[PDB]
Design an enzyme around this catalytic site. Structure first.
Site, PDB file in Angstrom:
ATOM      1  N   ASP A   1       0.824  -1.450   0.294  1.00  0.00           N
ATOM      2  CA  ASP A   1      -0.450  -0.455   0.489  1.00  0.00           C
ATOM      3  C   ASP A   1       1.356   1.427   0.346  1.00  0.00           C
ATOM      4  O   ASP A   1       1.252   1.575   0.396  1.00  0.00           O
ATOM      5  CB  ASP A   1      -1.150   0.090   1.094  1.00  0.00           C
ATOM      6  CG  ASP A   1      -1.973   1.192   1.331  1.00  0.00           C
ATOM      7  OD1 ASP A   1      -2.721   0.895   0.236  1.00  0.00           O
ATOM      8  OD2 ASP A   1      -1.778   2.058   1.799  1.00  0.00           O
TER       9      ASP A   1
ATOM     10  N   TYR B   1       5.283   5.830  -1.604  1.00  0.00           N
ATOM     11  CA  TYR B   1       5.953   7.095  -0.521  1.00  0.00           C
ATOM     12  C   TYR B   1       7.097   6.913  -0.142  1.00  0.00           C
ATOM     13  O   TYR B   1       7.983   7.648   1.138  1.00  0.00           O
ATOM     14  CB  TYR B   1       4.577   7.914  -0.048  1.00  0.00           C
ATOM     15  CG  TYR B   1       3.476   8.571  -0.480  1.00  0.00           C
ATOM     16  CD1 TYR B   1       3.851  10.048  -0.874  1.00  0.00           C
ATOM     17  CD2 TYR B   1       3.132   7.443  -0.911  1.00  0.00           C
ATOM     18  CE1 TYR B   1       2.971  10.076  -1.382  1.00  0.00           C
ATOM     19  CE2 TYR B   1       1.917   8.635  -1.803  1.00  0.00           C
ATOM     20  CZ  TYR B   1       1.766   9.664  -1.978  1.00  0.00           C
ATOM     21  OH  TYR B   1       0.375  10.810  -2.898  1.00  0.00           O
TER      22      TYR B   1
ATOM     23  N   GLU C   1       1.063  -1.051  -5.109  1.00  0.00           N
ATOM     24  CA  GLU C   1      -0.201   0.264  -5.501  1.00  0.00           C
ATOM     25  C   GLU C   1       0.212   1.221  -6.267  1.00  0.00           C
ATOM     26  O   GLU C   1       0.745   1.727  -4.679  1.00  0.00           O
ATOM     27  CB  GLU C   1      -1.068  -0.239  -4.529  1.00  0.00           C
ATOM     28  CG  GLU C   1      -2.653   1.212  -4.078  1.00  0.00           C
ATOM     29  CD  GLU C   1      -2.930   2.123  -3.580  1.00  0.00           C
ATOM     30  OE1 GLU C   1      -1.943   2.044  -2.735  1.00  0.00           O
ATOM     31  OE2 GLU C   1      -3.452   2.648  -2.965  1.00  0.00           O
TER      32      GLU C   1
ATOM     33  N   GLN D   1      -9.883  11.086  -8.145  1.00  0.00           N
ATOM     34  CA  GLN D   1     -10.455  10.373  -8.537  1.00  0.00           C
ATOM     35  C   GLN D   1     -11.268  11.089  -8.697  1.00  0.00           C
ATOM     36  O   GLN D   1     -12.490  11.792  -6.994  1.00  0.00           O
ATOM     37  CB  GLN D   1     -10.318   9.615  -6.758  1.00  0.00           C
ATOM     38  CG  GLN D   1      -8.866   8.563  -6.988  1.00  0.00           C
ATOM     39  CD  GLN D   1      -9.195   7.850  -6.230  1.00  0.00           C
ATOM     40  OE1 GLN D   1      -9.557   8.377  -5.143  1.00  0.00           O
ATOM     41  NE2 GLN D   1      -8.143   7.224  -5.569  1.00  0.00           N
TER      42      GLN D   1
END
Lengths: 480, 480, 480
Positions: free
Chosen positions: C190, C194, C231, C336
């Protein structure tokens, strides 16, 4: 101060005739009533860039004339000369001394030594505002053979001064004092936007340091009897910033805005600009450079600016661009359009006289470029022989050519307009913009009993000037 | 300086509590250090348009208070009140006498009588610049039963004054004398752009006549100890025209410019405006009206205004539109966006404080609207009861509501900013815009040893304020 | 192949019924033939972001079930579970120790301490790629009373791990070893982009360090018998970079691409994508998040993405935006779109079934989100009550609600489609895109004698599936 509120001529020292003496003859023969002042592009000894790489500001280049030729002008006219605050030539005494004595030289501090910055990141390198695709550094060889890099913004011959050092101020004060002793009352501060260098910034127009330097130059010029005309090509807001500091801004927004107004017969953006224009400006239509686009952003909507670029580019040579721009159809891309103002107007005399009258009634001191004064066209042959794009707007005039062009009817109309603007007293009063439709312009000046009014119909390019006779109350209509 | 260079509050007489005594108690309790002045929206007896249809300027409407309630402010605070130079109520004594005595009335000349213009061409009718889709003429029945038409720009109860007649000046001079005697030192000249009526023109901001009216009002105001704040919603250039004539313009360009700057994290256009912004301006973020679009044309590119309009309109009530403009997505179409500034900024506390910090550091006197002071949201419920869109920004605050809202953390941050802005001496000096990247803004004020600096990062909505304590001689950070 | 090439379900642990046992009963009752695998959203103890702030990966939240409940699914099904490589909860044992013991704690190196970077210039703050309009730092008070800042990308409850320290790798290997011991074979990494923080960079997807971290996790995963699905929501090129790393990318390009394809009856960009789509990819139409726009850039022309955005946003709740991006109609602005896939397709049963059929025929393992499985509509009430936009796509289903929605004809059609895709052997072969016009799509799979063909007419939303039965060797038509 007390510079004459009259038309000024912008000229090279040698582009009319061969030298300053021939230029003086033409001015005294035809322009004694038409103009009150002159801007003579740099006449110093210079090794690059059309005189803007001066070895010193204390000498007149012998090929064009002598200090006595210059002073012949100071007798009857105001004199505006360049002061290259950003850089001096590499052949200058101060730099050649730095080459001779290295860091032992007394002038070593006068220049910017790149090593002081250390490693400069790619991000910070990209931020630097220069047209050239080459880092703004020049490696130079000292006499002992040591290789050192000094900051150089323009050609290799121009070496940037270091305004961290006091020597730059002494060098500037030294030039200003000499020039003013020669009778210069207006100093054009060339490339003042580059004087501050700070890594992590654009190195162009860094605030507030840029105004601190400007204020010092302005104070010293005032010491010596001169006003200042700092030159910046960028967003119009900087002309306002100059104006607020009691200096003369340039009316660079006027040429492209006026070009658009006449080509489209629209007065709306021109009237909006006249209502808010900076107070003490020198206005121009054409200059020695080229019609500059950035100075009109905001003053003209982007789509209108694009329309002007597309219209002009057909009648002009290749434009000067900002570095790695890529899409010419973009306003952001184009720095300057290379054409003579008369060619941009498609050589319509009525349109050109309309432009000059609107300029002359605009607040501020109007400056007329010599090519425009003679209604010159694009000089394609000179551009081919010189290899310089800007030479299309810098034609060399023979004295016989000036006599042939002075008689041209469009030039005769222009000369009477200049004499009216240079002598009629209403221009010493205050400016009154008048209501008009979106296809015409109405401008007026009032000084007590004196009054002159300009009406231009942009559809038909008709120019009407009404004035109050100084001798008599009854109003009169200028021939224009 | 006649006015204090401090924050000013714009409020209705009755929107905080029910009356002027309730407003005074709130100002005294919470704002005595925060503001130096107050603008109270019209408190005269009025029959239409939220107080802007005054029967007279010499009376306080009994429901809101008494003239003594007004003087309570004038002892400790500067006072700004409206003077409706364009129109007075039809229930006014002057107009009511005109209905009674018809053209025999001594006040008959005070109004504009449509028949004097004779037939008006459809072309001349089209030029007239008014937002309503109705002709600007109203038929009235005199007491004898004859019908005559008078010009009225806004609602039917407001009747336009005739500035061809000296009676209009006499009335305004009478109003100015009474208001200044009560302690008004700043006069907001409402809708002054309509005062000149000439067929064949827009009848809006006709030059140069509109400035001759402004100069007389300014000279009369100065004799009586008041300065003038003329109100125009149009191209920013008119604010420069006001500034040049030694009056206070409105910083109407700032609200849309800041909203776009904060919403898009772009400082480029804001810094261009700050660099050239007009001299003696009163700055606003929110007003009693609505965020006005024409005031930002040219200051912001058309593309960005379109972006700002679509962004706000998607989450806000219906905009006010210019007359018969079909395209919602055009700049030309939108007159005012209806939103609260706090809601326009998405109720982001950090973004809101950053906006006020930038306003306070902008040159000129900053004005804070009462709704924005309490960080109020859109009042859709008030709009539904009233039937008015402008009421979304005109919430009625109960005394208990004020006490709870004053306590909100974002409001406490704003109050601390207002105290600093109203008291810190560096603001009486000169403004220094500072270099920054295109996502942040850096502003400073220097007055001798006093110095304050504001840095705002528009990506992260962070505010940093540094100031020097002169006795300490050390930099200090003001929490914001 | 370690995973079954069959349809997978994405579900919460508690969104179907109240717990994992309730979910198991629905899967066993209706999906035993339809699906081969499950992605169960985080069932760990978590204090923020819908389970994505885990205190530990080694515990199951007692409210949703026990580790034995997880192990029920593993015995008959593939299990995909999240590994939050970027961050852990502030209530985690490791971070709680750091609050208690400060920089003396054994876990101090596990987090990112902002003061080590020193003063960060405004330009370097601006490069940082984070969606939230806040600085990525959270000030926390140590028990001693000291205030220090730790890096945090998402909510304040999620504290970013420091991959310069070995403690982070030791922590992840401990999690991976435990999770696989319970029978998880697919680890969803996930927010892996980053994990790299370097001042002067975006701090997002820093190459090549990001792949070195990615390679490490994959090696640990493969040793323990699990594959990885990292992801990333960004340009498609990152899915190719993942694919060439022997790791499963997400087919994030497909949902927006398919939506445009069906809404506009255009198949060209879809066929261009299907021809070059990344290998070994898990495909999705709907996810637990909203439909992500940056993953389709380059795959769809910007103008078509603009068309999709305007179409969806007109009938749906607010989109999630990229940081400080005013322009709501711009591709750059939108992150989104928040609406269910069924509502995105206007609740058109044929178009929805055609979209799933195309997804199931796209190379890779198809994943079906539980809301899409039941053909759920936008849940405005849940979003109104929660305040979370994404909740419009995360409806809570009661067990009885499930029983009637499974019976819906569009859902029965989808279920037959899942059983065919999960069981028919041709999908284990090789993929053949077929020629079609710009209004329809033709896709096929061949494995030896098994062959199935999909034809979708986008104008009429008709679905035709033909397959061969090997013993018959005869083409057959599948209800859909």
């Amino acid at each position: 101060m007390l510079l004459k509120n009259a038309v000024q001529l912008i000229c090279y020292p040698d582009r009319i005739g061969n030298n300053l003496k021939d230029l003086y003859t033409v001015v005294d023969t035809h322009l004694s009533e038409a103009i009150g002042g002159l801007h003579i592009l740099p006449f110093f000894p210079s090794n690059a860039d059309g005189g803007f790489s001066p070895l010193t500001h204390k000498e007149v280049d012998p090929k064009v004339g002598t200090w006595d030729d210059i002073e012949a002008f100071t007798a009857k006219y105001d004199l505006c000369v360049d002061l290259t605050v950003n850089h001096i030539s590499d052949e200058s005494p101060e730099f050649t001394d730095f080459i001779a004595n290295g860091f032992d030289s007394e002038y070593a501090d006068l220049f910017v030594h790149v090593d002081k910055f250390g490693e400069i990141s790619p991000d910070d390198m990209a931020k630097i505002h220069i047209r050239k695709e080459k880092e703004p550094f020049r490696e130079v060889t000292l006499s002992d053979g040591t290789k050192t890099r000094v900051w150089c913004t323009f050609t290799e011959q121009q070496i940037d001064l270091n305004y961290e050092s006091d020597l730059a101020y002494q060098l500037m004060e030294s030039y200003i004092g000499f020039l003013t002793s020669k009778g210069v009352n207006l100093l054009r501060l060339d490339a003042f936007g580059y004087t501050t260098k700070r890594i992590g910034t654009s190195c162009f127009l860094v605030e507030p340091e840029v105004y601190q330097i400007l204020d010092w130059v302005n104070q010293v010029a005032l010491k010596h009897g001169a006003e200042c005309l700092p030159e910046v090509h960028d967003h119009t807001s900087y002309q306002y910033a100059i104006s607020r500091r009691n200096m003369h801004p340039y009316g660079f927004a006027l040429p492209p805005l006026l070009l658009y107004s006449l080509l489209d017969a629209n007065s709306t953006y021109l009237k909006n600009w006249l209502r808010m224009c900076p107070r003490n400006m020198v206005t121009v239509l054409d200059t020695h450079d080229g019609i500059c686009i950035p100075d009109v952003e905001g003053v003209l909507p982007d789509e209108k600016i694009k329309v002007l670029i597309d219209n002009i580019d057909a009648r002009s040579a290749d434009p000067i661009m900002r570095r790695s721009a890529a899409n010419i159809h973009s306003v952001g891309a184009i720095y300057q359009l290379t054409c003579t103002f008369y060619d941009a107007l498609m050589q319509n005399d009525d349109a050109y006289i309309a432009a000059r009258a609107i300029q002359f009634f605009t607040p501020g001191i109007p400056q007329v470029y010599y090519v425009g004064l003679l209604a010159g066209c694009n000089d394609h042959e000179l551009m081919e022989q010189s290899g310089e794009l800007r030479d299309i707007n810098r034609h060399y005039y023979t004295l016989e050519e000036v006599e042939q062009d002075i008689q041209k009817p469009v030039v005769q109309r222009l000369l009477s307009l200049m004499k009216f603007r240079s002598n009629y007293p209403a221009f010493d009063g205050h400016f009154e913009l008048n209501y008009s439709n979106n296809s015409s312009v109405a401008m007026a000046w009032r000084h007590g009993d004196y009054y002159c009014h300009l009406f231009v119909d942009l559809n038909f390019k008709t120019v009407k000037v009404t004035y109050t006779d100084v001798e008599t109350g009854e109003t009169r209509h200028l021939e224009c």
